[PDB]
Design an enzyme around this catalytic site. Structure first.
Site, PDB file in Angstrom:
ATOM      1  N   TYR C 505       0.850  -1.193   0.000  1.00  0.00           N
ATOM      2  CA  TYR C 505       0.000   0.000   0.000  1.00  0.00           C
ATOM      3  C   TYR C 505       0.881   1.237   0.000  1.00  0.00           C
ATOM      4  CZ  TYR C 505      -3.468   3.475   1.016  1.00  0.00           C
ATOM      5  OH  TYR C 505      -4.268   4.558   0.948  1.00  0.00           O
ATOM      6  N   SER C 588      -5.271   1.109  -5.145  1.00  0.00           N
ATOM      7  CA  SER C 588      -5.356   2.545  -4.910  1.00  0.00           C
ATOM      8  C   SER C 588      -3.960   3.169  -4.766  1.00  0.00           C
ATOM      9  CB  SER C 588      -6.217   2.822  -3.676  1.00  0.00           C
ATOM     10  OG  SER C 588      -6.723   4.102  -3.856  1.00  0.00           O
ATOM     11  N   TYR C 589      -3.629   3.738  -3.594  1.00  0.00           N
ATOM     12  CA  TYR C 589      -2.244   4.177  -3.384  1.00  0.00           C
ATOM     13  C   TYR C 589      -1.294   3.000  -3.663  1.00  0.00           C
ATOM     14  CZ  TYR C 589       1.510   7.271  -1.954  1.00  0.00           C
ATOM     15  OH  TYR C 589       2.582   8.105  -1.964  1.00  0.00           O
ATOM     16  N   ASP C 666     -15.963   4.638 -10.210  1.00  0.00           N
ATOM     17  CA  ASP C 666     -15.096   5.026  -9.108  1.00  0.00           C
ATOM     18  C   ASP C 666     -15.183   6.535  -8.942  1.00  0.00           C
ATOM     19  OD1 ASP C 666     -12.978   5.453  -7.253  1.00  0.00           O
ATOM     20  OD2 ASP C 666     -11.896   3.712  -8.046  1.00  0.00           O
ATOM     21  N   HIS C 698     -14.745   2.495  -6.029  1.00  0.00           N
ATOM     22  CA  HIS C 698     -13.374   2.244  -5.592  1.00  0.00           C
ATOM     23  C   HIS C 698     -13.251   0.916  -4.857  1.00  0.00           C
ATOM     24  CE1 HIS C 698      -9.304   3.592  -5.258  1.00  0.00           C
ATOM     25  NE2 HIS C 698      -9.303   3.726  -3.938  1.00  0.00           N
TER      26      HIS C 698
END
Lengths: 723, 4, 723, 4
Positions: C505, C588-589, C666, C698
């Site tokens: 992450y 995501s990140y 998203d 998301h």
């Protein structure tokens, strides 16, 4: 010898030479920076030095010479919109003065421009309004004031008229000597918008929402009006009167389309109108009344064209071809046996006379003189996938000469033609089964004048490549011939079992089995991967009569799907097919059929690729969809609209490997269509492969995306075939 | 026309 | 013995048992039908029977009992919006007269509702305006009249305040006894809209365009005002007067945020404001002035919190914990060594006193009495990925007692806590490294009263399964410890070589190496596929002090990406890692970091998977992105915004197999971000694998999409590792 | 955040 590799296809290593000419007169043509050629002798002189516009400061996308040769229209700042539409800037160069014209310039972001058919008047559309220039350097006369972006279109088509009715952005028609300018006006006020994101270059921080008036099946359609203005009159308060010609009463009772505009004389125009239920069409023939300045359409000159088994026309009612005096015309019509043939009409008599007949079809009328009509047909050798030029003597219909059949029967079975202005010369373009061959001929005695391009250089190059071959043949089903073709690997051996890829399109009036020579993905699959690439023309396919064409009327997604499956079974029975390695692929309608086949449960196909498929006919546009499917209402055809979706077959995709591909900026077959396929597959727990193409449209045709999609599909097929 |  | 399979993960075969309680007083809690428990004895009664609403006619999503126990709010017609926001319908049930209230009902489509903290007043938000009911059957008082969809938000947050500031849709704050209702108002007038298509059920003919006010980095932000209304002096005749509290002058000089609201007493409220450049924050402390009806925030009570090395707070300035009289408060603050510790403030003094110190951090203040402050820290054994409950004697800061460290040290190293209304009791929730363990305790002498839930059932099921193990360790980069964890296959054999998946992450203040027990995709990969699943906390990770956390200040996508590469290098040199088979994935990140690693040209990683990645910080929202990156202008940090995109690294993906996945709906990391990744890969001729999820957000968390995505990723990883 |  090397094979024809994927890189050869994608890099265009082996290029077909063309010979693209533009007739400027009855005896000269322009050819490319620019040379003018004398047709009779073949000599040329330099028409426009390739250095002339070195210092012009813009790259010139295209040119257009006025019919009197006095001016050249230069198109630059080209920006593509839909299949035919675009905007551009224009300058006019004066060929006598060798001067660019710097005053009263055509504006930027012009949507359409055309010279008058004689002289050098210009008509153009800018911000959805029509303007006329009598002289290139003088001010424009505004013709319309109603133009409004996305709402009122004067002289240009909206999305659906562009794509499905006129195959053109232009909705302007000069009369033959340029006195009158006819135009259509489309009103999209209540047409719903398709909306989709456009991401643009990565510097764009927020995506852009594209909104296009686009009637999906059964939705509210654009309405249309038709006008004629007298451009010679541009001497009245600068405000020339646009005279409306209204549609006939049989059309005004409900939704309808303007589907054809053809001038017959200086003072006589013919219009064809089509009911929204597209099995009923009316041609009006309208004369200018000098005393009132209005246009009158005598009901005695109205002609009705209707179909009891289908829709009217191959894709729309055919164009008339008028004799010089405008008192009679020729038109391709389905005869009583269902075959499209040339019918000869007097303008005020309702019964026409067929001048051709037989179990084959006229493809198009190409030229008409006082003595001869020239047309293309698939008569020769009973091959619906061949095309030849014929000429029929107007004073004796038993005198029909095939002009192209026997020129090179081994090399050339598919011709098109380009006649000079008064048909004194014609260029024949042979496109297969051998390499394309371009020749020039004189109509006075049909002598071959010279070979323009024979592709001998490509011939020499291809001799060092293991090229595939092509078989074109048929199978009999229910005592009916259905034609197929196979792209066969080099050194094809009937005793061996090959993987087979069925390349499907199969839309109404399609033809995927023909004599045309192509260099394409199939060439690589056959040459390098030793895959047989097959195509089949089943029920619904074109150029073989209405009994075959109309077999899918009101029933898209049935027989044309079943017949691709049956074709694959038939090919398996031929003995050279590994029946464990049969795949299927297609684009657009072909992606629809591919998907329907893969969802059929037939077990015949291991895997398939659908590119920008239709998935549900209510998502596609009204004009195309309703032509075949009627309206999606309980009273008309909703049950079959709902029965023919890809999504309802999702469970059966558990049996197959599927690759689904779509460009996100597809204005034609909306990304929505594949978005719903994928969601239905996810909802039933089906794994599949997917690829979106950011900002690509229906053609996925930018250089990089074109290369990327065929690479990605090649990997998928090779993996499926354990290659 | 549903065709590229 | 069976392994832990992909279907076990996806169908939740092995469920962790929980013990979710709701303290209603200092001695009783509710437990769901609905029972009420006495903490001292563990006896219970039925508070509401599961049959009471059998005839209600709606599925009841949730319930909320008023603080005094007299009423229950029944929530139904739940419709989710963003991570926290939703609308619902509400009915109120009178528990004493055993009647639904049929009069003055809360409207359908209510956006937020809350009881006062004592008694049974209600405040709700409907159509973006605030309403108060003093009694459940009485007419509402309308508090605000300016609410306007997507423009003016009263008492609810807009998208960016919901997601990035308050982690809540609510922007309502009752005073402790319910006298006053404070609320924020957001004005999004000039905030640009993100627009994206939503396809819906296949019945929907035209896709919908969703438009959300959403400021991307550097764009115009919402503005904010703050108000307090006295709910005891509302009138049926006149409109309610809301008293505004304006932000201090140091905030009004430019863009700013309201970032915390905490009532101190019945008549004292504290607010924290944050500059748009998020390294400077101000707390105001405001007292009700009965003579003027005003709220005054004395300048002498203002408290400034700034950072010279990064932003303020972990994700935002921390919440103060006021004493009973509200004259002083405790607050977590980064100390002079960059470690976050508890500071004790007096409301009118600038200097605060740290009551804790050391090379570890306080995670949260959990409860405050006159004698003790209770907090969670990672002090124990110097393990930043462990969490324990401590209390500190407020009269002698040297007297600190760990209350959870030694309860069950082998099983329990990660605790959270829930205290009764004035800390007479607490529930401890142990979440690893063994199975979760819930226990109840009394504060007086920290006695362990009872085991609420020990997961003994799952423990015995899991004995029959070949479960993976977890190793938590560290590697030393530049004399700094950085921690990692490895999910290790059953029967782990140090002499064999295993493929390794780096699960990343790596966002600012993140922590992926911890002592928490999880049942997730990695459990299946290790148990069934014999993959080591490793995670690493490098520069930028949290809970280890600002030297590590702030290392990526103004520089996202640099050190935290390189540190994952370095960790994987170290791992790849261990004798039980197959260096030919190292993969990376994240969401995501983590999809951004995965993509930046795959594009780095390191050669360490064979393949990877990015799910809903960020790709370019200008596409992400202002509050989060600017916190770390400043503003994307040439005077501030535009160069690093432009150097830190995935797209610029496209060429380096030729070395790797990449799977790019994103939901089309998203609202958080827009599909745009992956659409630009794919376009850049196509533009450099890099093949890759893709999957879009139609209408997924998301979380890609619908039942079918969640199953589908993990199935598709499992195929990709297996083929990458030859399984 | 850009977390989940």
């Amino acid at each position: 010898a090397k094979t024809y590799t994927l890189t050869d296809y994608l890099k265009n290593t082996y290029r077909l030479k063309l010979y693209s000419l533009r007739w400027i007169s009855d005896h000269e043509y322009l050819y490319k920076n620019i040379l003018v050629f004398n047709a009779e002798y073949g000599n040329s002189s330099v028409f426009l030095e390739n250095s002339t516009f070195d210092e012009f400061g813009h790259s010139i996308n295209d040119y257009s010479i006025s019919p009197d040769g006095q001016f050249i229209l230069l198109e630059y700042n080209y920006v593509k919109q839909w299949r035919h539409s675009y905007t551009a800037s224009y300058d006019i160069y004066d060929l006598n003065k060798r001067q660019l014209i710097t005053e009263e310039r055509i504006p930027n972001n012009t949507q359409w421009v055309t010279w008058s058919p004689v002289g050098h008047k210009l008509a153009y559309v800018w911000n959805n309004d029509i303007y006329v220039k009598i002289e290139p350097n003088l001010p424009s006369y505004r013709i319309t004031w109603t133009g409004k972006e996305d709402i009122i279109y004067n002289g240009i088509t909206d999305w659906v008229y562009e794509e499905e009715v006129f195959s053109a952005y232009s909705a302007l028609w000069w009369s033959p000597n340029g006195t009158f300018l006819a135009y259509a006006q489309f009103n999209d006020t209540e047409v719903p918008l398709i909306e989709y994101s456009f991401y643009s270059d990565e510097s764009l921080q927020y995506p852009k929402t594209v909104r296009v008036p686009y009637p999906k099946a059964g939705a509210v359609n654009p309405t249309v009006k038709f006008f004629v203005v007298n451009t010679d009159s541009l001497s009245s308060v600068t405000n020339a009167t646009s005279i409306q010609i209204t549609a006939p009463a049989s059309m005004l009772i409900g939704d309808h389309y303007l589907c054809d505009v053809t001038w017959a004389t200086q003072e006589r125009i013919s219009l064809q109108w089509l009911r929204r239920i597209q099995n009923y069409s009316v041609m009006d023939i309208c004369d200018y009344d000098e005393s009132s300045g209005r246009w009158n359409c005598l009901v005695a000159r109205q002609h009705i064209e209707m179909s009891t088994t289908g829709w009217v026309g191959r894709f729309r009612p055919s164009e008339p071809h008028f004799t010089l005096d405008g008192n009679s015309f020729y038109k391709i019509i389905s005869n009583e046996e269902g075959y499209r043939h040339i019918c000869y009409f007097q303008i005020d008599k309702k019964d026409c006379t067929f001048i051709t007949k037989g179990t084959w079809e006229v493809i198009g009328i190409e030229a008409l003189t006082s003595d001869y009509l020239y047309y293309i047909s698939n008569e020769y050798k009973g091959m619906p996938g061949g095309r030849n030029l014929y000429k029929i003597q107007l004073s004796d219909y038993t005198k029909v000469t095939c002009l192209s059949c026997e020129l090179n029967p081994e090399r050339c079975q598919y011709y098109s033609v380009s006649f000079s202005k008064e048909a004194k010369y014609y260029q024949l373009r042979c496109s297969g089964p051998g390499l394309p061959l371009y020749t020039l001929h004189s109509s006075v005695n049909d002598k071959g004048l010279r070979v323009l391009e024979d592709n001998s250089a490509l011939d020499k190059m291809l001799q060092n490549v293991q090229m595939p071959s092509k078989k074109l043949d048929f199978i009999i089903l229910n005592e009916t011939k259905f034609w197929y073709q196979m792209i066969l690997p080099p050194h094809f051996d009937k005793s061996k079992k090959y993987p087979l890829l069925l390349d499907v399109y199969a839309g109404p009036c399609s033809q995927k089995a023909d004599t045309v020579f192509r260099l394409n993905w199939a060439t690589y699959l056959a040459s390098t991967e030793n895959i047989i690439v097959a195509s089949f023309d089943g029920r619904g396919s074109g150029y073989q009569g209405d009994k075959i064409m109309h077999a899918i009327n009101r029933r898209l997604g049935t027989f044309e799907v079943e017949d691709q499956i049956e074709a694959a079974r038939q090919f398996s029975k031929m003995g050279f097919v590994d029946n464990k390695r049969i795949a299927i692929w297609g684009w657009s309608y072909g992606g629809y059929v591919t998907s329907m086949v893969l969802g059929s449960g037939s077990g015949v196909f291991k895997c398939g690729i659908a590119v920008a498929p239709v998935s549900r006919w209510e998502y596609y546009d009204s004009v195309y969809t309703e032509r075949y499917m009627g309206l999606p209402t309980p009273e008309d055809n909703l049950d079959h609209y709902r029965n023919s979706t890809v999504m309802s077959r999702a469970e059966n995709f558990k049996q197959v490997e599927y690759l689904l591909i779509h460009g996100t900026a597809d204005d034609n077959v909306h990304f929505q269509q594949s978005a719903q396929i994928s969601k239905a597959l996810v909802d039933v727990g089906v794994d599949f492969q997917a690829m979106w193409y950011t900002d690509e449209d229906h053609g996925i045709a930018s250089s990089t995306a074109h290369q990327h999609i065929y690479t990605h599909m090649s990997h998928f097929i090779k993996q499926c075939f354990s290659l | 026309v549903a065709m590229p």
